[PDB]
Each structure stands twice: as C-alpha cells, then as structure tokens.
Paper text:
The Kaposi’s sarcoma associated herpesvirus protein ORF45 binds the extracellular signal-regulated kinase (ERK) and the p90 Ribosomal S6 kinase (RSK).
Such motifs are present in several ERK substrates and are known to bind at the so-called F-site with higher affinity if the kinase is double-phosphorylated (ppERK2). ORF45(16-76) was found to bind to ppERK2 with <1 µM affinity, and a shortened version (16-40) retaining the FxFP sequence bound similarly. To reveal the structural basis of this interaction, we determined the crystal structure of the ppERK2-ORF45(27-40) complex. RSK alone did not protect ppERK2 from dephosphorylation, presumably because of the dynamic nature of this interaction (since it has a high koff), but ORF45, particularly in combination with RSK2, was efficient in protecting ERK2 from the phosphatase. These findings could be explained by the following: (1) FXFP-motif binding directly protects the ERK2 activation loop from dephosphorylation as the former shields the latter from the active site of the phosphatase; and (2) the higher stability of the ERK2-RSK2 complex in the presence ORF45 indirectly protects ERK2 from dephosphorylation because the C-terminal tail of RSK shields the ERK2 docking groove from the binding of the phosphatase. The crystal structure of the ppERK2-ORF45(FxFP) complex agrees well with the structural models put forward in these studies, and we posit that the viral FxFP-motif has evolved to bind to activated ERK2.
Residue numbers in the entry:
A (entry chain A): -1 to 360
B (entry chain B): 3 to 5, 7 to 20
C (entry chain C): 29 to 39
Write the structure that this text describes.
C-alpha cells in the first residue's frame, strides 16, 4: 500500500524547504542541512535507536549522469568502511521500481564541516596538523581501493564535536582500475574549480589520483590563511591563479602535458615568477609548508603520493602505518562499466538497495 | 565554538608515544 | 573536451 499513509497513521511525511521527505515512521523531526542540484541532506531523529541521523534525499532518475553518480556513491560507500569516511547505515526507497522516484540515504550525523569552521574560526597549528592527517588517512584508504574522490574540498570534510573528521559526497567519485588505461576515458569536468588540479584542465580526461592530493593542498592552504589559495573566476583565470603562485612551468613540467594545443597555450603565456610560500604564508610552520609545496607540485606524476604525505615530518606525531588501513578487496575494472542508459541504471540502483528493504530475508 | 584530547584517533596515537 | 578549449574562443 502506502507506507507514507501507514506512517501518517502515527507521524508521516514532513516538508523541508519545499521538499517532502517520505522517510517513514522510523525517521522524524527533520531539519534542513544543505542541498545540491538533485539532493538534499537533513538531520533527523531515528525513533528506533533514539539518536539523530543525517538523511540525504536523492532525485536522479530524470538524468543519466545523476543516475550514474548515485549508483557509484552507493556502491563505493556500501563496500567502504573506515573511521575518516562516512558510511551508509540505511537506505529507503519504494518497494516497486515503478514508484521509486526518490532514494533516501541515512548516514552518521556530523555537527559541522571544515568549510563552516573556517568561516568562523582560525585553526591552531595542532588542529591543522591533526585535521590534515585525518584527511590523508581516509584518502589512503580511498586510493587503496582504486577510487578517486574528485571533489575533496572543505564542505566535503565533516567534523563533529570531538574533532573527528569524515569524508563525504562520493557522487563525483569513480573507480579507475590501474591495470587498464583511462587516458581520454575520464569525465572532463570534475572537482570544484578552486580545488581543481592543473592537469584536469590541461589534460582533459587524462588525470590520475594525484588530483586528490592537489585538492588536499588547497584545503591545507585554506586552513592556513582562512582564504582560498586559487580563487579562479573561470578556467583561464584559474590557470592564471595557479601559475601566479607556482610561477611559470618548468620545461620538464611542460613535457608532462600530452595536450599539445594546451602545451602551446602555456608556452604562449607571459613569464610569471614563482612566489615563495613563506612570503605568502608568513606564520605557517615550515614543516607544513614543505608538505604544502609538495602536494601543489605542477607535475602530477611527481606529486607526493598519499602514503608519502603521511610519512612527512609534519605528521610524525600521528604517523602510524599499522593503524592506517586499506580495503580488503580493491575495486576492479568491472565496477567502472556503468556507461548505460538511466533506465538500466535505475534498475541497478534498485537492486543495490534491496538488502535494506524490510523483510529482505537475504 | 566547540573546537584533540577527546578524539579516539588522537588518543590512540598518544598512547603509543 | 567541451569546456576546456585552449585555442582561445573569441571574447
Ligand atoms: C555533501 C553531501 N553528501 C553527503 O553524503 N553529505 C552529508 C552527510 C552528513 N552526515 N552528517 C552531516 C552530513 C552532511 C552535512 O552536509 N552531509 C551532499 C548533500 C546534498 C547534495 C549533494 C551532496
């Protein structure tokens, strides 16, 4: 019948900023948190466990790319398990695929995020250091499963009252099995502009995991000055912003560009001189600035890998390889085969959420 | 305003050294 | 590469 109507018998559908949340009798007392193009996250009260949770309503079935991203986030998160990464505790959707217009994702509730924190507070070095370590600890696990986040930014860094950090919004994430070649196969417009690596623009569809390391450095820079490091208006201005600090690329740097048209654009650019970090960031710990420089390296292949970053001096107090785990089974090439129509993707989403359905009985 | 000594991960690191 | 054309489009 109608679960909402059955819920309505006690307490049922609730309205939040023009969006109805049919999260059933179990979840009530929803409060708006944030929203995206096709989704909205709310805090809510789990009446069964008598605790508050976060609920993400997803409405992707109209568009094929939304469906692709929804299935990727659900499949990656359901198999991921890590301290510094958000997980899926429950999934809510209609019993029949015909009625499935929205999909509800229930996650651990986090009080705030790094983006919110930096607007109101300046972080002490020990806070920056600990936050940065946690970011990389989750990132090590992510890259260990052959997964690229592709949207690391302050807003995607959840924070609770006990200085615990988790990474969320894996909708832009994707599998890239290392054995296969992905040059020219990867989605072109990825990451947020200010945290977008140079090679994403310069080598469209030919980037690697190193784009995440670049984002971390931007976040680290943002923590250090409570201000974005590369506030580009558009991709041209963004490229100018990147080269404003790093300076004109080296010839070795120029040789890693495989887009010849792009390389010639760089050659056509006026010479700009590299800016030292200490002048830009006077009060920053040099140990941090040594690592900051190393994750902002123009060359992606020579960019500091996630394991190497953890072992950098600046995190030596928190560095412990025996408690920086990896996934038991990384993701293979078969998991990236989602170049499908949305009607098929909708079926795949429906199958993947079947375990959460009431009385599944495996 | 509720900005270490309460985080499980930080505690585990300190215990070792 | 629809959005990253390095031959500059006319302003
Ligand atoms: C970034 C986010 N994706 C996600 O999983 N968010 C999440 C989980 C949370 N738990 N506790 C809090 C919390 C938050 C708070 O922002 N957000 C999103 C949201 C809307 C549209 C697209 C994408």
């Amino acid at each position: 019948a109608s679960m909402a109507a059955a819920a309505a018998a006690g307490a049922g559908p609730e309205m939040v900023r023009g969006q109805v949340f049919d999260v059933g009798p179990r979840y009530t007392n929803l409060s708006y948190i944030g929203e995206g193009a096709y989704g909205m996250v709310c805090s809510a009260y789990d009446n069964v466990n008598k605790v508050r949770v976060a609920i993400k309503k997803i409405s992707p079935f109209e568009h094929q790319t939304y469906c692709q991203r929804t299935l990727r986030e659900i499949k990656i998160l359901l198999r991921f398990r890590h301290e510094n990464i958000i997980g899926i505790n429950d999934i809510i959707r209609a019993p029949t695929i015909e009625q499935m217009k929205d999909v509800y994702i229930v996650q651990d509730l986090m009080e705030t995020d790094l983006y919110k924190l930096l607007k109101t507070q300046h972080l002490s070095n020990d806070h920056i250091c600990y936050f940065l370590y946690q970011i990389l600890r989750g990132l090590k696990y992510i890259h260990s499963a052959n997964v690229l986040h592709r949207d690391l930014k302050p807003s995607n860094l959840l924070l609770n009252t006990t200085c615990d950090l988790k990474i969320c919004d894996f909708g832009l994430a994707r599998v890239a099995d290392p054995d296969h070649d992905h040059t020219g196969f990867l989605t072109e417009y990825v990451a947020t502009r200010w945290y977008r690596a140079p090679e994403i623009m310069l080598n469209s569809k030919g980037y690697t995991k190193s784009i995440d390391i670049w984002s971390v450095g931007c976040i680290l820079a943002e923590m250090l000055s409570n201000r974005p490091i590369f506030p580009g208006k558009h991709y041209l201005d963004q490229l100018n912003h990147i080269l404003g600090i790093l300076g004109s690329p080296s010839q070795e740097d120029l040789n890693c560009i495989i887009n010849l048209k792009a390389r010639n654009y760089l050659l056509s650019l006026p010479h700009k001189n590299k800016v030292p970090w200490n002048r830009l960031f006077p009060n920053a710990d040099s140990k941090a600035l040594d690592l900051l420089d190393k994750m902002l390296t123009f060359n992606p292949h020579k960019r500091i890998e996630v394991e190497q970053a953890l072992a950098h001096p600046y995190l030596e107090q928190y560095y412990d390889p025996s408690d920086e785990p990896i996934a038991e089974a990384p993701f293979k090439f078969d998991m990236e085969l989602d170049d499908l129509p949305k009607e098929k993707l909708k079926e795949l989403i429906f199958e993947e959420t079947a375990r959460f359905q009431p009385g599944y009985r495996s | 305003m509720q900005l270490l000594d309460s985080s499980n991960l930080a505690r585990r690191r300190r215990r070792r050294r | 590469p629809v959005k990253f054309i390095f031959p500059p489009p006319p302003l």
